[PDB]
Design an enzyme around this catalytic site. Structure first.
Site, PDB file in Angstrom:
ATOM      1  N   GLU A   1     -18.914  -2.322  23.880  1.00 42.91           N
ATOM      2  CA  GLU A   1     -18.123  -3.533  24.070  1.00 42.91           C
ATOM      3  C   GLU A   1     -16.857  -3.516  23.237  1.00 42.91           C
ATOM      4  O   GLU A   1     -15.784  -3.903  23.702  1.00 42.91           O
ATOM      5  CB  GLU A   1     -18.919  -4.809  23.754  1.00 42.91           C
ATOM      6  CG  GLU A   1     -20.103  -5.090  24.638  1.00 42.91           C
ATOM      7  CD  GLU A   1     -21.373  -4.410  24.173  1.00 42.91           C
ATOM      8  OE1 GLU A   1     -21.378  -3.693  23.129  1.00 42.91           O
ATOM      9  OE2 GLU A   1     -22.410  -4.609  24.854  1.00 42.91           O
TER      10      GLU A   1
ATOM     11  N   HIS B   1     -30.304 -13.492  23.929  1.00 36.26           N
ATOM     12  CA  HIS B   1     -29.445 -13.300  25.093  1.00 36.26           C
ATOM     13  C   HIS B   1     -28.889 -14.633  25.595  1.00 36.26           C
ATOM     14  O   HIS B   1     -28.331 -14.645  26.703  1.00 36.26           O
ATOM     15  CB  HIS B   1     -30.172 -12.524  26.215  1.00 36.26           C
ATOM     16  CG  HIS B   1     -30.398 -11.092  25.853  1.00 36.26           C
ATOM     17  ND1 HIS B   1     -29.759 -10.023  26.452  1.00 36.26           N
ATOM     18  CD2 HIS B   1     -31.151 -10.570  24.860  1.00 36.26           C
ATOM     19  CE1 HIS B   1     -30.176  -8.897  25.870  1.00 36.26           C
ATOM     20  NE2 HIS B   1     -31.015  -9.212  24.904  1.00 36.26           N
TER      21      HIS B   1
ATOM     22  N   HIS C   1      -3.948   3.096  -3.609  1.00 37.18           N
ATOM     23  CA  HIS C   1      -4.126   2.694  -2.211  1.00 37.18           C
ATOM     24  C   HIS C   1      -3.452   1.362  -1.944  1.00 37.18           C
ATOM     25  O   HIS C   1      -2.746   1.233  -0.956  1.00 37.18           O
ATOM     26  CB  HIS C   1      -5.616   2.570  -1.843  1.00 37.18           C
ATOM     27  CG  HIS C   1      -5.859   1.875  -0.529  1.00 37.18           C
ATOM     28  ND1 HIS C   1      -5.580   2.474   0.686  1.00 37.18           N
ATOM     29  CD2 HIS C   1      -6.314   0.640  -0.248  1.00 37.18           C
ATOM     30  CE1 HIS C   1      -5.877   1.626   1.660  1.00 37.18           C
ATOM     31  NE2 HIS C   1      -6.341   0.516   1.118  1.00 37.18           N
TER      32      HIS C   1
ATOM     33  N   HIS D   1       0.839  -1.208   0.000  1.00 35.52           N
ATOM     34  CA  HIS D   1       0.000   0.000   0.000  1.00 35.52           C
ATOM     35  C   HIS D   1       0.857   1.234   0.000  1.00 35.52           C
ATOM     36  O   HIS D   1       1.351   1.651   1.036  1.00 35.52           O
ATOM     37  CB  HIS D   1      -0.868  -0.017   1.253  1.00 35.52           C
ATOM     38  CG  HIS D   1      -1.781  -1.187   1.361  1.00 35.52           C
ATOM     39  ND1 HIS D   1      -1.379  -2.418   1.825  1.00 35.52           N
ATOM     40  CD2 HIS D   1      -3.109  -1.281   1.121  1.00 35.52           C
ATOM     41  CE1 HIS D   1      -2.426  -3.226   1.844  1.00 35.52           C
ATOM     42  NE2 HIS D   1      -3.487  -2.556   1.409  1.00 35.52           N
TER      43      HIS D   1
END
Lengths: 632, 632
Positions: free
Chosen positions: B391, B453, B256, B28
């Protein structure tokens, strides 16, 4: 609509919700109580047919905080959906119609929610889906809103920022997000962990932002009228008191996730003019007013059906609702060596040409995932969606495309970045929706990008997730057969595809891709069976040829889909799995021991190097595999 | 510092980077070229010792876009780190010191990066870690900056918004984020998928925002001086041209991720006054100027060591650098029935009391995860971190705490939401850092919250991920033994813990938790072995007692850690695994077939209902398990 009737309606919702939670001795009463005034007013704006929850031009209501399920269920029952008072009395009980978080098997529930943030992204997806539906069917036929109720937890999650970024970009002036700003989270005051200028955040993402008292009926109504006329996606920041109406529990974080208590509920009913010694009570004025949604909804849908009949879009809508997967002529890849990302991209193009509702995109990796739908244009006018670097929101948005009514969506990224979208993939699986996941760059064959970009454990994850098919085709022909199964299946599918060129296979000897595993080579009194998927099948064919030259009879099994193989009968499995069975995959796939005596995989992370160097390093050569099989 | 020397320095970095990529035929080059002017100026501000990359008060530099590795490696080589010119010539080659994305085994690399967004959250974590280090050791000893270079991909990812939310809340005025705004992503112009007001977004999150031309040395220098004096976290929006200096590839998205090409590089060198026919060239003025970092860094660290010697913090720093895990007296849970979330919470408190650098928190679930460190205060003054509903950023932040030099962090959430943080857990594993993951609510025993859950597939994911130990203790004693192993281990660990009460076990018969699996019951000529972990061990003990009453000799094996069991020798495994081996877990854990003939698990998603009702539904009773074992 007036203050007296609205108060009675809101309190009816509060006490159904509280009573449901109390009877279950489980659940979340605080948010229902905080949101009851808002929902009461919203009931006058929502356009929906309780007796036909599939009406295509209905407003879509999403509770992103699925924990507030009792309030949703109360509203569905009161409005005339197929959810009874007895069902409310069965809240959170095994096999009831009223599970703790909403499930689409309950009629009226738009999308399963629960994991925070998901619902906000789903609602953005319904709004994008509606814009595409408007492109296809016209503004005469598609003109509805998408209302989402969310809370602090939803807005802290990264997925919310990602989805709302796209909502502003796409000028989703059909999307109304109502944020329950109650100052509370599980760990106590929201300020312990959050102090953003929420108005500025959303204005930075192209929203119009309104700020109200969520317990003032006039302010709620005025905000909704303004939001409905917005030329932007609109956020209503509604300041509320958690457990509003519940006396000593008002404002208490403890009211979020535990029953209010019998005495608190008695007192709350007393203060509201309700009889404290009865439960599951629906007063007459509120009963009649909420249930008038039935007559109103029937008339709205009738008017809409008349517009459809006058439209020039009738046949198109029928094709979208009744796709014909049987007619599709897929490419013929027989004998053609190719990377399966490339066979798959050609298939995606055939599907998009044949199916007016098939569309999707990549999380900024189109050129690498090979997902461009050539000459089919960019969303909204065309089919190619540019999700940006937003894997998680992409999958949650496409879950909503799959629920909208007329679309067959695909989500694409590198297989290693499946981990960024896994929680939303799980919702697809839970709902059994038709949403296809395209995962290229499936192994250490990625090469130089190195171990951060080389999948190892992801195949195990997707195979372990229920209600998913995980296809890892070894060639283009397998890739086509996998799509034919995936379109007919009742659950979502993932396609695990190579960067690098693979060798075309010879034709099946016994069984086919439909069986999950099948025989490519069968020998009488086979001493060994080499079982592989994807890029490792050719290694096993070559190794079996060497073993045969050395005097060992071998079977070779291609296993494009582990989950389908698990469903086959014992007679079929026993024909395939002869002698000592060796599983071979460029993955850490211990699940292969279900079928194999030995597994030849990868137990570590990968390495940065040329693909051929990396495969050799990890043992994927004929000489090494044969030495392993011959235990020396 | 002047324009002539800076231009030569920047171009030296450009052509080392370009030449590295070209020799590898992989990588890159566009971002290195776009960022070279910024890095050249930044080299005059960065405080670091190339000959001691562990100097605690060094500035921390993070490349969030790990794809720009060639530029980082060029800078480390030029500055005098232990990375040679030959190493640069080995870019992206198997087993080199210069892998395609940066790895901490290369000295000078602060943290492994690659998956987009991670590095931004890691940098926020280094800034939080530094604030806590300043709290412990004083502002005389901790005063450094955290510089992060990021791009469009990083800022679209949800994790970036989450982490930056926390940076503003905690007033991280040691954090400087430099955004390479080059208008390009993989799918072409950034506007295809992104049009946020970035200044407003970051101001909403409490940042100071500067906007510069990233190719103007004076503007870069002035921005850095201003950023260093900020009372807020600071964002520098640096407008750059991708592949700046590379003629026809300037501004091209194609620059890129592929080599520039030999002719493009020749032309670029010609335009810059470099000889086009030589590669890996370092001009004298630039060589001397970059390598002066060695002398400067030695003097900076020497001055700092003198402050340490004068401090009252010497003994504390030595304890933090040399924690004594052997001395710790853990709770004695022998014979005590408990939920393992509760035993674990007591252990976390003992660890925090004994270890000055042990700290952590939950993603807004402290009361449910049982992670409060009682009377130990809130960050920054105390030990309890309130991550909010974030999280993923939590785990990436704690990866940086683990790399800072003095901390032992833990991240906590429900096991189902491990999926939100899995990509960052994987970086912990890749780096082999000491970062502990606390996952409560491990199964269908969650009950009423229902299938969204209830974990099913997560145990398989964590077991399949390399360089992780996944502990699922059946009682408090196992929970303690698991911590003793985890603190001594060379890799991260997860603790998979129950909501519901479990039964205390009797003492081991043969082996222990250190072996991963061990015998709780051993019978001569065993016909069956029942193998389980966590909450299913007691079911197996009870079932084995029933089988023995019916005349079948049984072994019972507790397997708190699958990965450790995999490391045991054949003699040990063969002693445990007698007769027909049945694995029993409340999970879809096909990996158990590595050790078991049969697996008694869960193949579907769960159900909303009372825990006892859900376990019965899924077959977890003595009568059902015994019927299964007796095949009738």
């Amino acid at each position: 609509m007036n203050i007296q009737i609205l108060q009675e309606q809101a309190n009816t919702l509060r006490f159904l919700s509280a009573d449901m939670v109390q009877k279950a001795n489980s659940g979340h009463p605080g948010a229902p109580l905080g949101l009851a005034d808002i929902l009461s007013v919203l009931s006058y704006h929502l356009k929906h047919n309780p007796k036909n929850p599939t009406w295509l031009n209905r407003d879509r209501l999403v509770f992103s905080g699925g924990h507030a399920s009792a309030l949703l269920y109360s509203f569905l029952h009161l409005s005339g959906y197929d959810l009874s008072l007895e069902d409310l009395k069965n809240f959170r009980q095994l096999h009831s119609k009223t599970p703790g978080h909403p499930e689409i098997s309950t009629l009226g529930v738009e999308i399963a929610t629960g994991p925070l943030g998901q619902g906000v992204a789903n609602a953005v997806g319904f709004a994008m889906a509606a814009k595409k539906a408007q492109n296809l069917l016209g503004s005469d036929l598609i003109d509805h809103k998408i209302y989402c109720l969310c809370g602090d937890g939803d807005l802290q999650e990264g997925i919310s920022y990602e989805a709302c970024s796209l909502a502003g970009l796409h000028k989703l002036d059909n999307f109304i997000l109502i944020y329950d700003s109650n100052n509370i989270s599980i760990e106590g005051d929201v300020g312990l962990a959050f102090n953003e200028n929420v108005k500025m955040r959303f204005e930075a993402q192209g929203f119009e932002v309104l700020s109200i008292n969520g317990h003032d009926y006039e302010e709620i109504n005025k905000a909704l009228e303004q939001a409905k006329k917005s030329t932007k996606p609109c956020l209503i920041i509604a300041k509320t008191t958690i457990a509003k109406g519940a006396g000593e529990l008002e404002g208490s974080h403890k009211s979020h996730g535990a029953p209010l208590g019998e005495e608190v509920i008695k007192k709350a009913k007393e203060q509201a003019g309700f009889d404290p010694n009865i439960s599951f009570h629906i007063p007459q004025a509120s009963k009649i007013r909420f249930e008038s949604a039935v007559e109103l909804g029937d008339l709205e849908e009738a008017k809409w059906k008349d517009k459809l009949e006058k439209s020039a879009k009738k046949e198109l809508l029928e094709r979208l609702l009744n796709p014909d997967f049987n007619k599709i002529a897929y490419p013929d890849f027989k004998g053609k060596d190719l990377a399966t990302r490339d066979s798959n991209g050609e298939i995606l193009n055939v599907l998009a040409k044949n199916l007016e509702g098939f569309l999707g995109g990549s999380a900024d990796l189109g050129p690498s995932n090979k997902t461009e739908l050539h000459s089919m244009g960019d969303f909204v006018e065309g089919k190619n969606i540019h999700f940006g670097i937003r894997e998680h929101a992409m999958a949650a948005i496409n879950n909503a495309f799959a629920r909208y009514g007329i679309f067959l969506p695909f989500s694409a990224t590198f297989f290693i970045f499946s981990e960024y979208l896994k929680p939303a993939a799980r919702i697809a699986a839970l709902m059994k929706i038709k949403h296809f996941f395209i995962f290229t760059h499936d192994s250490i064959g990625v090469g130089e990008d190195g171990p951060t970009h080389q999948p190892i454990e992801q195949l195990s994850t997707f195979r372990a997730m229920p209600n998913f098919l995980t296809f890892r085709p070894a060639d283009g022909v397998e890739n086509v057969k996998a799509w034919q199964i995936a379109l007919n299946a009742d659950i979502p599918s993932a396609f695990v595809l190579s960067r690098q060129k693979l060798k075309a296979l010879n034709e099946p000897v016994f069984g086919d891709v439909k069986n999950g595993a099948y025989l490519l080579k069968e020998s009488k009194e086979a001493k060994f069976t080499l079982l592989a998927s994807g890029s490792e099948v050719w290694l096993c064919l070559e190794s079996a040829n060497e073993l045969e030259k050395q005097g060992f009879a071998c079977n070779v099994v291609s296993m494009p889909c582990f989950e389908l193989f698990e469903k086959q009968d014992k007679a079929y499995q026993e024909r395939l799995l002869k002698g000592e069975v060796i599983g071979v995959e460029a993955a850490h796939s211990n699940e292969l021991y279900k079928f194999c005596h030995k597994v030849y995989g990868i137990e570590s992370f990968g390495e940065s190097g040329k693909d051929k160097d990396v495969f050799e390093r990890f043992g994927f050569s004929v000489s090494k595999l044969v030495n392993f099989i011959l235990s020396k």
